[PDB]
């Protein structure tokens, strides 16, 4: 019951080259299965999967988190908060089959890193070593955030993941990717136009679009723009709160700053709860398919 310690353990004999191969397999499949979700591709859902398998972490007792790769167990993959993520897991199945040596946690997190980079986002340093843990270590449902809340809720929620205001605003920028699907979350619509290209569009849209608070077909309120975009109440709270607003403006006006801050916050999210040995390998920075000429 005491605060357990999760020590990163490198998959036996593996090094950078091995993980670059897994990265490449994921990236090649992202390119191949381009028709998914009306041609948005699997990039966005893989990022969401990485964030939800990591977002269960509780700094207070080190339960949940990316280390154990517990999403593979029914209790967690059936979490209502994870509806739709099965698509990401299905995508990674053939990858895990080809590289059975990689842990589930390493695969889920690497999937998110690969997706961000392939979608032209910033490089995200990634460390290996997550080790699969038993089904009884699977966190209970209810640790992921609700979308119908305000800024105070968001701020308090993220304190459990040890994220401050800047980290929260930076992480939310991932919503430039993909869209909400009524059947999955009770919300419908994309946050922007370039659904599968990682940019700071989320912030520009929050500030520049003309938003109207409306009710969707699930009878839930969401902010809609004439451009056909939407914002969840939690997204919109970032411009209602004065502290969050200042940061949103910063990122809307500095693409490089957003990339650097997102990279740090995303790696931190994916590494929360993990203790890396003094002699563990340095973080890996994978080359994109484009950089490799593949
Ligand atoms: C207050 C926190 C957050 C809330 C309430 C929230 C809520 C949601 C909801 C309701 C969806 C739609 C799911 C669906 O209908 O398919 C979604 C999608 C998504 N979220 Fe968030 N999210 C939050 C934070 C984040 C963070 C921190 C990241 C990652 C850094 C992230 C990345 C994504 C991505 C990429 C999608 C698109 C998935 C797809 O298109 O299939 N989210 N989120």
Swiss-Prot record:
Q: Which residues carry this modification: Phosphotyrosine?
A: 153
- Where on the tree of life does the source sit, at the highest rank? Eukaryota
Sorted alphabetically, the Gene Ontology cellular component annotations on this record are: mitochondrial intermembrane space; mitochondrial matrix; mitochondrion
Q: Which residues form the active site?
A: 52 (proton acceptor), 191 (tryptophan radical intermediate)
> Where does the entry annotate site (Transition state stabilizer)?
48
- Give one GO term, molecular function aspect: peroxidase activity
> Which residues are heme b-binding?
175
Q: Cofactor binding mode, per the note?
A: Binds 1 heme b (iron(II)-protoporphyrin IX) group per subunit.
Query: Which UniProt key words apply to this protein?
Result: Heme, Hydrogen peroxide, Iron, Metal-binding, Mitochondrion, Organic radical, Oxidoreductase, Peroxidase, Phosphoprotein, Transit peptide
Task: Give EC number(s), comma-separated.
Answer: 1.11.1.5
PTM summary = CCP1 precursor is processed by the rhomboid protease PCP1, which cleaves the N-terminal hydrophobic transit peptide. The m-AAA protease (composed of YTA12/RCA1 and YTA10/AFG3) is required for CCP1 maturation: m-AAA protease promotes membrane dislocation of the CCP1 transmembrane segment within the transit peptide to ensure the correct positioning of CCP1 within the membrane bilayer, allowing intramembrane cleavage by PCP1.
Q: Where in the cell is it found?
A: Mitochondrion matrix; Mitochondrion intermembrane space
UniProt cofactor(s): heme b
Q: Where is the signal peptide?
A: none
List this protein's GO terms for biological process. Answer: cellular response to oxidative stress; hydrogen peroxide catabolic process; response to reactive oxygen species
> Catalytic activity annotated for this protein?
2 Fe(II)-[cytochrome c] + H2O2 + 2 H(+) = 2 Fe(III)-[cytochrome c] + 2 H2O
Q: What else is known?
A: Present with 6730 molecules/cell in log phase SD medium.
Assembly and partners are described as: Forms a one-to-one complex with cytochrome c.
Described by its record, this protein's role is as follows: Destroys radicals which are normally produced within the cells and which are toxic to biological systems.
Q: Which family does it belong to?
A: Belongs to the peroxidase family. Cytochrome c peroxidase subfamily.
The name this protein goes by in its record: Cytochrome c peroxidase, mitochondrial
Underlying gene: CCP1
Part of the full-length chain shown: 68 to 361 of 361
